[PDB]
Design a protein around this ligand. Structure first.
Ligand SMILES: NC(=O)C1=CN([C@@H]2O[C@H](COP(=O)(O)OP(=O)(O)OC[C@H]3O[C@@H](n4cnc5c(N)ncnc54)[C@H](OP(=O)(O)O)[C@@H]3O)[C@@H](O)[C@H]2O)C=CC1
Ligand SMILES: CN(c1ccccc1)c1cnc2nc(N)nc(N)c2c1
Length: 206
């Protein structure tokens, strides 16, 4: 009683699949973070009476977030680590794998509980992204494509926008991005502190 919900991956990456620098983001793009926050937080009106989304993230990503911004507010946060240690935790769930997270989530927020899960997002680590791309339930990438070869030292693990992956991964119409996301979303290049970036949505049949 586990594999009912698909997973969505959300990432901002350069054209050379760069995602990370010295354990942080290699840009500072306030509107891109606003998009990330709205997408990961958005629940249909009828359902936000008790439903919330889930953000699953790697322990190095969790450590990368400024303390003022943990746990990611208004979403259920779950940190994936092989080391059942202590992320001294507000209510900070921890699991040793992406499947252990889902089990913990379905156990914790059951069809009877006061808080109910709406959508489930994987928000990073390269290492956690790698696990997600291998997961049979993952069917959607909310990608922010950043059009600058920004120097990075951590890379998204699977070239999903490249030719070799084009039979599996398909980029959806911008109107299809909107209603999945449930809001008007800028179409085309956005410019914030020197780079062009744009919002994309890719899917892969289960
Ligand atoms: N969209 C973007 O642009 C994003 C960029 N980032 C950036 O990504 C970089 C971090 O990526 P990365 O270093 O790969 O870090 P991760 O966040 O993937 O954290 C890696 C660690 O988390 C745990 N982990 C990850 N996957 C699994 C798994 N499948 N099973 C069990 N444990 C797992 C392990 O923790 P342990 O060692 O405790 O066993 C692993 O050592 C940072 O620069 C951050 O800024 C992060 C999110 C988004
Ligand atoms: C890790 N992260 C973050 C979030 C809040 C504060 C500092 C860092 C972050 C920031 N922006 C993100 N943008 C997208 N499109 N996808 C992600 N997984 C993103 C993740």
């Amino acid at each position: 009683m586990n594999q009912q919900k698909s997973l969505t991956l959300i990432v901002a990456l350069t054209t050379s699949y760069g995602i990370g620098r010295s354990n942080s983001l290699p840009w500072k793009l306030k509107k891109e973070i606003s998009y990330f926050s709205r997408v990961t937080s958005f629940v249909p009106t009828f359902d936000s009476f008790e439903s919330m989304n889930v953000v699953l993230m790697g322990r190095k990503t969790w450590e990368s977030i400024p303390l003022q911004n943990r746990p990611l507010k208004g979403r259920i946060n779950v940190v994936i680590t092989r080391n059942e240690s202590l992320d001294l935790g507000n209510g900070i769930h921890s699991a040793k794998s992406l499947d252990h997270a889902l089990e913990l989530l379905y156990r914790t927020y059951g069809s009877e509980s006061s808080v109910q899960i709406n959508r489930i997002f994987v928000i990073g680590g390269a290492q956690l992204y790698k696990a997600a791309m291998d997961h049979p339930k993952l069917d959607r990438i909310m990608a922010t494509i950043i059009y600058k070869d920004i120097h990075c030292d951590v890379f998204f693990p699977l070239k999903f926008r490249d030719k070799e992956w084009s039979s599996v991964w398909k980029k959806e119409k911008h109107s299809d991005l909107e209603s999945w996301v449930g809001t008007k979303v800028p179409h085309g290049k956005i410019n914030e502190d020197g780079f062009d970036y744009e919002f994309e949505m890719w899917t892969r049949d289960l």
